[model samples]
Structures are given as C-alpha cells and as structure tokens.
Target: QLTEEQIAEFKEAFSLFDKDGDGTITTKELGTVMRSLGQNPTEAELQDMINEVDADGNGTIDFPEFLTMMARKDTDSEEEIREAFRVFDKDGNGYISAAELRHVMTNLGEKLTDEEVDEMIREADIDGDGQVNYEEFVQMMTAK
Candidate 1:
C-alpha cells in the first residue's frame, strides 16, 4: 500500500502528463514523458506498457489506468499479483530465477547487467535461496 504522499506524488506526475486537463494521457504524451527520461521507446514497447495497465481497452490513459501502472503494489489483488508472478515464472517453476527475470526485462527493453540482476535477486531471496519464491516476492514488495 502506498502512503498518502506517494499517491499524491503519482497524481502530481499524472497531471503533468495530462496537459489538456481532459484527465487522460495519449500515446504522444507518454512518448513525451519517455523521451524526457532520455529513452526512446518503440511503438510496440509503448503499446505493451499501456496494455499492461490499461484495463478498459481505451486508447488513452486515464487516472485509474495511470494508477494501475504506477501503484500496482497497492492496486493489484493477491490473485493478480500471483498471476503476474506466474508470468515471470516462465518454466512454470514456483520460484523466479535471475535468468527468467532478465529475459522478461530484456523483452521490456530494460536490459540488466549481470550485477544488476544479481542484486535484484539478492533483494528478494530472503532465505538465501538463489531464486525468488512467491512469498519472498510478496514480502519484498510489501515491506517497502
């Protein structure tokens, strides 16, 4: 769950993208934000990111959609989180391996170095296991 400050911060960021005050951000606006972050995303990448969070299938991103993209920890139900975990568990294994995460992240256009991937795995592998189990993933996310 996000603190009020975090919610407020998300709202503020959304407002910056919703320039026309219509309360939605178009792909153009999202591309603007992406470019501002010094990254150029492909059309498919942008669409994929939108599809991941846009529940209504509308081509625009409204506040609710934005919240899903940003506040997943607060918004996703336990089942939803489990489903997401399953996606990362490519081999149908209960645990997520560093290779699996690296593959997924690479598909998302955020390729991680070996060191970065190791760090991420270490953070969630509370039992000192090499992989992140569902419980460890949930704990890592909820512990803030």
Candidate 2:
C-alpha cells in the first residue's frame, strides 16, 4: 500500500495513464503509467504486460482486473492467504498451476524450485482429487 504521501503520488501517476478519468484504467493508460515509473517499455514489453492483466479480454482493463495486477503477491502466511490468492485463479481450477505461477513470477526473475512448486500444489489440493477447485483453493489457502 502506498503511504498517504504516496497515495497522492499514485493519483498523479495514475492520472497520467487514465486518459478518460473514468476511474478504471485502460491498457494504453497503464502503459503510460508504467513509463512514468521508469520502465523503458518497448512494444513487446507493453504487449506482455497487457496480456498479463487483460483477464476478461475486453481489450481494456476493468477495475478488479486492474487492481489485482497491481496488488502485491502472496507473501504472507500461506494458511492465512491461500483463499486470498485463489480469488485470482478465476477458473476455480483449484490451482494456479506451475505455468500460471510462472507467468506472474517472471517479473521477479526468480525461478521456483520444483519441490517448492509441488509442495504448494499439494497444499492447495484440498479435495484430494489431485487438483483444487476455485472454492477448494480458497479453503486450502485460508485453512490455517
């Protein structure tokens, strides 16, 4: 979360990209915002970022989708935040598979260990069906 001062900064930052000022940001707007943060984005870079968050694919970002992309990752205790993380899965697939996790984690340039990935999968597989559903993921994550 941005500090109070940072909030003002964020507003200024957000304003640069949110062209229509409709309170929801579009992909073009987000790119402008990203540049303000000093990322020298090329065409490929901008496309990748757009693909990462345009969940519903309306060619633009809705509020929830935009916020989820900006929000921090699941760094808190797994038990307390599993449900929280699962909320982003959208498919109730009971899991954000290794591939899915990989995409999101790429920004950090750190790879997850196979063992660590397997452990997270097992923990998230609350139903024992070898996979988790949307709600199951929520339960597993929050079941501390």
Candidate 3:
C-alpha cells in the first residue's frame, strides 16, 4: 500500500512520460523520457517495459498500472530499504528498538502513541523479540 505522498510522486513521474497529455504512456513516450534521463532503450525494450505494466493489454500504461509498476520497483530495491532502516536504526545497530522507532516516527511528525509504536513493532518483529532486524524490516517493507 502506497501512501498519498508516494502516490503523488508517482503521478508526477507518470505525467513526465505522458508527453502528449493523453493520460497514458506509449512506448514512444517511454523511450523519449528514458532517453531524456540519459538512458537509451531500444524500441523493443521500451515495448517490453510497457507490456510488463500494461494490464489492459492496450500497449500503453495508464496511471493505475504505472502506480503498480512504480510501487513494485520501489520495493525491489534493497538500497532504499537499507536507507530507511538506517533512519530507524539510530545507533548504527543492526536492529531497530522501540525507542528508536518512536523517535524516528516522532521526528517525521507521525505523533504515534506508545501503543501505536508497539503495534508497529509487533507487525515487523517476525521473531517476536520486540525489535526489528534488517530481515524482518525488509519483509515488512516488501510484503504487499
């Protein structure tokens, strides 16, 4: 589940590829946008990328399909998860404790109660040790 902020970012990215303002991204638009980003993709590769996300089989990517694609891509990157984990693992420890979790969430303006913090920890603490390790955090983050 993507948050509103994440969805907004995806919308902005999708708009960048929807060059003709058609509300959908064609292979040509995808290629052009990728090229502009300094990555040159062949026509077939462009078509393949669209096909992977074109749920309607229309040969173009709509907003919903694009959102799915982006979310999956975002979760598939371990670097992103590692960065997020570092934010919560304040002491450079390999695990995230409740104090660190609450601290980071508060810093991010979450305003979560202690109970809420515990609930979050419970959800991610796969081993039930009351703390989240990198593996559990990755599973929690990537689990759809």
Candidate 4:
C-alpha cells in the first residue's frame, strides 16, 4: 500500500523522469532517468522496461502505468493493489489478462478451464473488458 507520502514520492519521481512535463515518460526519458540513478541500461533493457509499463501499447509509461509498477502489495490501499496488479501482470501490460490468471490459478491447483477462467474474470470485470484492472482486482480480493 502506498501512503500519501509514498504516492507523493513516486509522483515526484515521475515528474523527474517526465522532463518534458508532457504527462508521459518515454524510453528516452527512462534512459536519462536511469542514467541519473547511476544505472546504464542497454537499449534492449530500456525497451523491455518500457514494454513492462507500456500498458496501452503506446510505447510510453503514463502515470497510471507508473503507479501500477510502483505498487506491489496485497493490502487494501491503492498502492498495495497497484503493486499486486503489476506483479500479476506477467506480460506487464497493466491489466491481468486471462492467460496470466490461468497460470496463477493452475499453479495454485485450481486448474480452471478457459471457460472457468472467463467466469472468474467475469466476477470482477464490471465492464467485461476481458482483463482485470487494479480496482476490480482489489474490490474482488478485499470484498470478503
């Protein structure tokens, strides 16, 4: 979970990376950001990092994607859910696709068929978008 402090810190980090202040961080910016942080990523690494957060296939990391990448926990807070969402987003496309859920469910011994996985997705996919976003996943997990 991200405390307000954490959110602010991450927002600040994003701002730093978004040197153009265009509201999105591009690969070039990431390279600069990485360099600033004393890490030199190869072009391939930079592309991979961008792909991990480029949820919309737009080749850039927006605030939401950045937040998702930063969040990696199971608590009831936005940061927590966002983090878990990122972790579960194996392909790193922001949303947890059915395939990702399948791998996780199978590993946990659920062995859900495709139809069953669709049913599970339907349980939280209010809009039936075929993928589960952070809020849906959070609500589904914390609803109890």
Candidate 5:
C-alpha cells in the first residue's frame, strides 16, 4: 500500500498532468508537457509510451496509465520521486510552493528568473494564497 503522502502526491501529480481535469491523460498532453520541460521527444517515443500505458485505447490515460507512463523513464524509484513531490507539496494542500518549484527548474537546467517563477506560481496558486501544492508544482513544471 502507498503511504498517505504517496497517495497525495499521486493525486497531486495526476491533477497537474490531467490538464482538462477529467481524471484521464493523453499522449498529446504528455508530449506537450514534456516539451515544456525542454525534452525533445520524437513521435516514436511518444507513441511508445502511449502504447505502454493507455490500456483503454481512448487516447487518454487514467491514474494507472500515468503511473506506468512515468515508470518507463527509469529516472529513479517512482515511490521516492513521489515522496519528494509530497515533501514539496508543503501544506498538505495537494500542491507545491514557490520555494519547492525552483528546484525543479534548476534541476532541468532551465534559465528561469525568480520573478518569472514567482509570477507563474502566483498564477497557479488556484486559491489566491500566493502558494502552491504538489499539483500546482506539476502544472508549473509541465504547463509553465
């Protein structure tokens, strides 16, 4: 069983990636988000991931699909990655904070200005608190 933090992070990450908020994901959504992270993905790569996950063949993915999609990357232990996201969620509000967000951009080697990141966070606050949770973090990373 996953921990509470893991569940929250999963939900949060899924929330961000599920742009339409319909509780499912699409390869187009995934690829678009990937490009924002500076990933130069080819159609074959996108198709491969989608073929591995979108079990329903609806061109969109559910939580399980999203999980499997990410796992294919072999970036790190998925649980560890999810846990780190939970820690960044910060307020247990199911999102991420500005402070937590910079680390992602830095890790990506993206040249983002503090003001820019802050502005983006402000927009993603979703509750007007000028802060974000893990969900917001994913949205910022993928959609910003």
Candidate 6:
C-alpha cells in the first residue's frame, strides 16, 4: 500500500545505497551510503542491517529486499495496516497468496522475479503456509 510517491522516494534512496550500480547493495556500499547521509554505521552494524533484509541469503540486499526494509521502517496505524493488508489479500480471503503478491508487486512498479516473490512471502509467512495471514502481515509491518 505504499504510494507511488513513496516508492519513488525509496527508489532514489536505494540507488544511493547501490553505489556500484550493480543493483545489489553490499555491506560496504550501505556503510558508505549511511555515512554520506550523516549516519555512520560500523562494519558490524552494517552487516546486521544487511542480514535483516538480505532475503535471498546472498549476503547482499537487492532492490526487493531494500523495499521490504523500507516498508518496515514506518509503522502505520492498525486500521491503515489492515487496509494495506487487504490490498494484497485480494478476493477478500484474509490471506495473501504468492500469485496475489506477485501481481501487486508488478503493478507497484517492481516486477520481482519468482524467487524474489517467494522470498518475500517466506519473510512473513511464518506458518510455512506459503501465504501471508493478517497477523503475520502485521508482524512484518510492525516488527523491529
């Protein structure tokens, strides 16, 4: 449910972090980007942040992972969060299937690869159900 404006802003930020322009944000690139933004992150700290969002276990943050990290930064109200969840939970099923997530992400301007889509769901689909339920979605939105 991120607005197009918000996504654009995030894209800008992601570009900044992707210093080498190879598409993925490495720990060194992230540290440099943070320092450039006036926040200095130590090597360990940078790795920690990267680990949190390196969804594919590639030791680097791709654009989709970056978007996921950015999404977690703002904790909207429960009502707003619910509305956001509903956007992905198409068909009013109270669950977001992989197909629905893929559809939404593509429409949101990021056409994620199938692997990326699966990783995204795995991030929040705690029960191994291959779909995200409301509670899991809430946790993803609000977790530290």
On lDDT, the candidate that comes out on top is 3
TM-score for each candidate, following the candidate numbering = 0.52, 0.35, 0.50, 0.44, 0.47, 0.50
lDDT of 5 by residue, 44-138 (tens): 77676677677888766789878876555243234434555665554566656676677665553444579978887887777687777656555
RMSD of each: 9.7, 13.5, 8.6, 15.0, 12.3, 12.9
lDDT of candidate 4 over 35-96, digit per residue (tens): 54335568787788778767898988899998876653222356545555665677887788
What would the TM-score be for candidate 1 when compared with the true structure? 0.52
**lDDT digits (tens) for residues 1-144 of candidate 3:** 889987766766677778687899988998876554335578998898888878999998999999878766432367657777787788987999999989976664356688978898998888899999999988876777
- Cα error, candidate 1, residue 134 (Å): 0.3
Q: What is residue 47's positional error in candidate 1, in angstroms? A: 15
Q: List the residue pairs that clash in candidate 6.
A: none
Ranking by lDDT: 3, 6, 1, 4, 5, 2
* Model 1 alpha-carbon miss at residue 83, Å: 0.9
Model 5: ten consecutive residues of lowest lDDT: 72-81
Those runs of model 6 whose alpha carbons end farther than 4 Å from true positions after fitting are 1-75
Q: Report the candidate with higher lDDT, 4 versus 6.
A: 6
Would you list the C-alpha lDDT of every candidate in the order shown?
0.74, 0.56, 0.79, 0.73, 0.65, 0.78
lDDT of 6 by residue, 103-130 (tens): 8656544567899788888988889989
Number of the top-ranking candidate, with TM-score as the measure? 1
lDDT of 3: 0.79
Candidate 1 lDDT, tens digit per residue, 1-144?
889987876777687677676888887777766554335667777777777778888977889888767655332447646766776788987989999989865754465789989998998898997999999877765664
Worst 10 residues of 6 by lDDT: 32-41
lDDT of 2 by residue, 1-144 (tens): 558975664565455456687876755676665443334456666666666778887666665565665563232344435534443344655566656554433432335577756776677776675555656655654464
